[PDB]
Each structure stands twice: as C-alpha cells, then as structure tokens.
C-alpha cells in the first residue's frame, strides 16, 4: 500500500496551477497624495482617503 511509480510532471504543473496570489497591480492612491496602499489600510506617510490620519 505505497506509491509505486512517480506522478507526472504535467500533473505537478496542473496541481500547482490553482494559485490565487496577485501582483497587486494597480495599487491605490490617496485623494490628496499619489502614495500607494492596499485598498483598506493607511499609507506609511499618515495619508488616507483624503482625510489625513497621522501627524508628524
């Protein structure tokens, strides 16, 4: 009751075809600044949705 003969490398390619990670393109920008973020978090500059959320 063990694997006998090796599975095909096309079948290995097809089982690996089900990937869903994205290249995140395009990234979103703030309504007052062209700085990039994912569609629901803050920028690393304190800008967010044209509101400004973290001071310096």
């Amino acid at each position: 009751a063990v694997q006998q003969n090796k599975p095909t490398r096309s079948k290995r390619g097809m089982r690996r075809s089900h990937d869903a990670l994205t290249a995140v393109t395009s990234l979103s920008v703030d309504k007052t600044s062209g700085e990039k973020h994912l569609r629901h978090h803050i920028t690393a500059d304190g800008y967010y949705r044209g509101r400004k959320v973290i001071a310096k």
Partner: protein, 120 residues
C-alpha cells in the same frame, strides 16, 4: 455548534482573553491610541463600551462601580468627571478601528484602536 454564539473564541483559553482585554482597556485609556492585531482591536470593543457607559453618572452609588477589573492611579480623578463629557455622553460609538496593514515580516493583519474624541 455556535448557532447563536456571536462571541469570537479567537486564540488561547477564555481566562487569558479576559485578563488580556481587561489589561488592554487600561492601556487604551492611558495613551488613547493602541496598535495590535485586527482581531484584538475588535475584541477589545466588547464590554469596554458598557464600561464607558458605566463611567457617565457622577452619583455616589455609581462611583462604587467601574472598579472590579481595571485599576490605575492616574484615572482616579477623570472617572466620574471627564469620561462622561469626553466619551460616554455621546451615547454609543466611543471608539474607532482602522487596519494599518500587516505585521513585520509576517502575514498577520495589524490595526489601531482610538477613542472617538481627542483632548484639546
């Protein structure tokens, strides 16, 4: 299973989550913004909003409460004096949540929780 239980069981035993979120309530009122995981930022809202509602009335009988789980030497004058007009007098909506992104080097979602009014 869970067919009316809307409480998040989150991670580790209930007695940890109790101790931790009762400590985090003291940590939140001290600095008025705290950073943690998105699940922890939302689970800190539970029973702390009723605790803010509890801090509104300045009567000597209500001054007996808000004292069983979270204590600190520097809230003793704000209790039953400021927490009303600053927060509890709003009638709900005492906090704000916002995801700040991911955790350093790993896929954990990170957020900040703040109080709905900032001191002037």
């Amino acid at each position: 299973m869970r067919h009316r239980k809307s409480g998040r069981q989150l991670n580790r035993n209930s007695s940890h989550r109790q101790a931790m979120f009762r400590n985090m309530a003291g940590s939140l009122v001290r600095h008025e913004i705290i950073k943690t995981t998105l699940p922890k930022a939302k689970e800190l809202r539970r029973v702390v909003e009723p605790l803010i509602t509890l801090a509104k009335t300045d009567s000597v009988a209500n001054r007996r409460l808000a004292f069983a789980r979270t204590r600190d030497n520097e809230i003793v004058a704000k209790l039953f004096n400021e927490l009303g007009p600053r927060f509890a007098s709003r009638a709900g909506g005492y906090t704000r949540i916002l995801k700040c992104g991911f955790r350093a080097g790993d896929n954990a979602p990170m957020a900040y929780i703040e109080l709905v009014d900032r001191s002037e």
